[PDB]
Each structure stands twice: as C-alpha cells, then as structure tokens.
C-alpha cells in the first residue's frame, strides 16, 4: 500500500489508524507543519502488537473509537502495547518530542524500551488521536522506516520472487531466441505464439518489479501499474488457454485447417478473458462491493468446462490418430496429455491446501508465509510453460508436426 501519509488534521474525528505487518527495529516518524497556531492541542498515540493476523484483518477504523475501550479493560486480544500522551500550548511546530531525545517508556500487555519503535517483527496497529481546544490548520506527515527505506514486511519476499521470475523469463526468452535462430529454414506457426506468451510474461514481471522498486524507494505506489500488470497477466493466460484448446483439437496438426473451425467456437472462448478481467483488477483494487463470490465462481466453472472440453478433444484426437498407424505424433500427444493431467492434479492439490490452511482457522497464527498464495500459481504456470517449450522445440526436421495433405 503506502508508507508515507499526509493528513489535514481538522477533518473528521481526528483519528488516524493503520494496521500492517512490520519488521523488527522500525521507527515511526511524525511531523507537523502549517499555519501560525493559537489553540491548545493534546496528542495521544497507541502502538499495539498482534499475536495473530486476524485482528489486523477485521480492523475497521469506523468504530475505532469503540475499539480503544476494548483495549482499556484488558478484555480484547492478547498482545503488548505502548501508549503515550502529550500537551502543547499553541502548536509546538519545531520541537522533536516525537522524533528523538525522549525517554524509556514501559509497555503493558518492566520493559524499558524506546518510545516509538518496534521491538519484534509482527503485525502492529498504530492509532493517533488529536484533540484541539480553544478550515484546515495543520498538516501531519506520518512515515515508517525500518532496516530498508520503506519496504515493510510481507513485501520483501514478493519482491525477491518477482526478481527471480524476471530472471527466469529472460532466460526463457534467450533460450527460445537461440533455438529459433539456429533453425530458421522451416518453422511452424504454433512456434511463434509461444514467443508472444514469453514476452507477455516478461513484461508482466518487469512491471511488477518496477512497481515494487518504486514503492520501496519512494513510499507511494504508482496508480497505473498493478492494473496494467493484471491486464497483461489475464491476456497471457487467455492466449495460453486458447492455444492449448486449438492444439488439442488437432487443427493444423492432424486435420486440415477447415474454414469454420476456430471461427464461432475457439474465438468465443475469449469471453473467459473478460471473466479474467473481473477478478484481477477487482481484486487488486479493494472494492468489497459484494462481488468476491461472483468473481471466483464463474471463473472456476468456466475453467472446469474448458478442461472437460480439452480432455474430450484430446481423447478423440488420440483415438483418431492411433487408427492410421502414426508413431511420431502419438508419443508427443501422450506426453502432452500426461503433462496436462499432472498440471491439473497439482493445481487441485494446491487449491485444496490453500483453502484448508488459510481461510479455515479462527485466527492465522502463521502469517509469515501469507504470500505463497499469490506466487504458487505463477510458479506452476512457468513450470508448465517450460515443459511445453521443451516438448515443442525447433529441430533439424521441423516438419513432422505438419498436416502433409
Ligand atoms: C471418470 C470421470 C470422467 C472424467 C472425464 C474428464 C472430465 C474432466 C474431469 C476433471 C476436470 C477437473 C477440473 C478441475 C478444475 C480446474 C482447476 C481450477 O479450478 O482452475 C483454477 C486453477 O487454474 C490453474 O492454475 C490451472 C488450470 C488448468 C489449466 C490447464 C491448461 C492450461 C495451463 C497453462 C499452460 C499454458 C502453456 C501454453 C503453451 C502453448 C501450448 C501450445 C483457476 O485458477 P486460475 O489459473 O485461472 O488463476 C487463479 C488466480 N487466483
Ligand atoms: C507558544 O507555546 C509555548 C510553549 O508551548 C509558549 O511558551 C513560551 O515559550 C518560549 C520559548 O522558549 C519561552 O521563552 C520565552 O520566549 C520569548 C520569545 O522568544 C522571550 O521573549 C522570553 O524572554 C522567553 O525566553 C517562554 O518563557 C514560554 N512561556 C511560558 C509562559 O511558558 C509560548 O508563550 C506560546 N506563544 C504564545 C505567543 O503564546
Ligand atoms: C536498530 O536500528 C538502528 C538504526 O538502523 C541501529 O542503531 C544504531 O543506529 C545508528 C544510527 O543512528 C548507527 O550509527 C548504529 O550503528 C546503530 N547501532 C548501534 C549499536 O548503535 C541498529 O541497527 C539497531 N539498534 C538496536 C539497538 O537494535
Ligand atoms: C489528553 O487526552 C487524553 C486522552 O487520550 C486524556 O486522558 C484522560 O485523562 C482523564 C483524566 O486524567 C481520564 O478520563 C483518563 O485518564 C483519560 N481518558 C481516556 C484515556 O479516555 C488527557 O487527560 C488529556 N489531557 C488533558 C485533558 O490535559
Ligand atoms: C522456475 C522456478 C524453478 C524458480 C524457483 C525460484 C525459487 C528458488 C525462489 C522463489 C521464491 C524464493 C523465496 C522468496 C522469499 C524468501 C525469504 C527470504 O527471507 C529467504 C529466501 C526466500 C525463502 C526465497 C528463496 C528462493 C525462492 C524459493
Ligand atoms: C481473444 C481473441 C481476440 C483472440 C483471437 C485470435 C485468434 C484468431 C488466434 C489465437 C490463437 C490462434 C491459433 C494458434 C495456433 C494455431 C496453430 C497453427 O498450426 C495454425 C493456426 C492456429 C490454429 C492459430 C489461428 C489463429 C488463432 C485462433
């Protein structure tokens, strides 16, 4: 999300709260700037740790004024916290009481810790309340800085994973270009679209890495990035699905390229991409407009129908091909169908494990590996793409996979 916040104090109830996972030994900086001052101020701040992620997930600021009393009777959730309050006559716009040269304030759950600092990597909730007693007047700048500049926890492993994915996709592109350049006398039209898929994946990974680098080094995310990356990912997935469907039917490999075969049938699968547009951009930009179930159900049903169609077409194509005594293409089709069935089994196992580990627990006691659900799918897609690349590689006699009328 963000690490730098600018807030006009005379707005609402003057409560500013945020809950997120933070590193150990991270500092929180508060600055105040604005017009000349004439009103008494009273600033109170709470910084609370979290035993499990649940209280950071269902934390709604709209009732935060109630939440404090839940933290006042010692009847809330377990976790140590620090509190402090200070009074200022007019504005105190040049003192650094919240910056340095403070004291050692004990935490309640004999601590003697630094005033405003994290003591262990964990989910933290920070709340600040300003009371003004005798139309913007001030401006509050809030920053968080740990061992890195602005890269909080839960984003470091994702950034490393995206870097590794960028390197892997660059290697894939280099290998494909080398193989293509080595054998250019006779290629296939199916061997040109795999380069397009690799290019789209490379662009998506580069966009993600650039966005993460900018958010780390500036503290503010780029608005038109995540949406573009999601759109590119959806386009790449739709292209891969349609290529697999067209290969499964034997269009151009077993049977001749009939006039209306892909027309009105294969192209109509492009609406799947539309559904892929309703779950990517919608999920990346938090809306919560009662569309999560509508974003997950039809995509799963469409994918199941596509898998059913692909398997039936593959069975029919293999049955037809075995009757004419063909051995070169039969082994390739058997390897292709084995890879597809293994991918389906791995995907179903992954989805069962993800649904049985994360969204079944009362509160997530293991929040460290909370990023795996956003990377296992990409890793599986990359592995399947590499296997398909190894299966369909240009060679000396690159014509065994032709129709040959
Ligand atoms: C004996 C009973 C009769 C059996 C007859 C056979 C009927 C079929 C039976 C069972 C089918 C079981 C289907 C289970 C549902 C599928 C999983 C699911 O829910 O679909 C899921 C999982 O999707 C997958 O990850 C894999 C789905 C399988 C796709 C396999 C083919 C394409 C793989 C990509 C390869 C590209 C390589 C292209 C190279 C060029 C090639 C020429 C949808 O997430 P998603 O992904 O959208 O993104 C999630 C983002 N959060
Ligand atoms: C604004 O707030 C401050 C504290 O929040 C008020 O306290 C005054 O702060 C000054 C700054 O050190 C103290 O020193 C005085 O400064 C004036 C101007 O530089 C100087 O002429 C005096 O000889 C003295 O050194 C001052 O003692 C302190 N006053 C009190 C009663 O504690 C400040 O008064 C507020 N400003 C206004 C205009 O109300
Ligand atoms: C916590 O982080 C701080 C800052 O990253 C470090 O404490 C010292 O910070 C100053 C900078 O003002 C450095 O010059 C010192 O080298 C840092 N270490 C010490 C021992 O002074 C340090 O990384 C961490 N400090 C503790 C006590 O864990
Ligand atoms: C500044 O605001 C805090 C609230 O964050 C005030 O703390 C209250 O103090 C009164 C009397 O001391 C009691 O009701 C409680 O101790 C506090 N109430 C809470 C925490 O809800 C503090 O008194 C304020 N400073 C003033 C008025 O000078
Ligand atoms: C295409 C396939 C083969 C690529 C596989 C890349 C693997 C090796 C990458 C992807 C994600 C990576 C992990 C991402 C995050 C972390 C946390 C860090 O504190 C230690 C390293 C560790 C645990 C990484 C180790 C290497 C890792 C597992
Ligand atoms: C989402 C929408 C806009 C995509 C529409 C593009 C269509 C026309 C593309 C996408 C995939 C393409 C197919 C990919 C693979 C092959 C194999 C080759 O041996 C003959 C051409 C053929 C069969 C292509 C024909 C055109 C095709 C069907």
Residue numbers in the entry: 38 to 146, 168 to 192, 203 to 473
Sentences from the paper on this structure:
The structure of hTMEM87A contains two distinct domains: the globular domain [termed the extracellular/luminal domain (ELD), D38-K213] containing three glycans, N62, N79, and N127, and the transmembrane domain (TMD, Y224-P473) having seven transmembrane helices (7TM). Taken together, these structural analyses suggest that TMEM87A is a monomeric ion channel with a putative ion conduction pathway that can be opened by voltage stimulation and closed by PE.
To address the molecular mechanism of hTMEM87A as a voltage-dependent cation channel, we determined the structure of hTMEM87A at an overall resolution of 3.1 Å using single-particle cryo-EM in the detergent condition. Although no phospholipids had been added during protein purification, and the protein was dissolved in LMNG/CHS detergent, PE was co-purified with hTMEM87A, suggesting that PE tightly and stably binds to TMEM87A. In particular, the terminal amine of PE formed a charge-interaction with TM4 E347 and TM7 W445, and its phosphate group was coordinated by R305 and R309 of TM3, Y340 of TM4, and D371 of TM5. The remaining R1-fatty acid chain of PE protrudes through the gap between TM5 and TM6, where it interacts with C375, W376, and F379 of TM5 and is likely to interact with other lipid molecules in the membrane bilayer. The residues participating in these extensive interactions with PE are highly conserved, indicating a physiological role for PE in maintaining the structural and functional integrity of hTMEM87A.
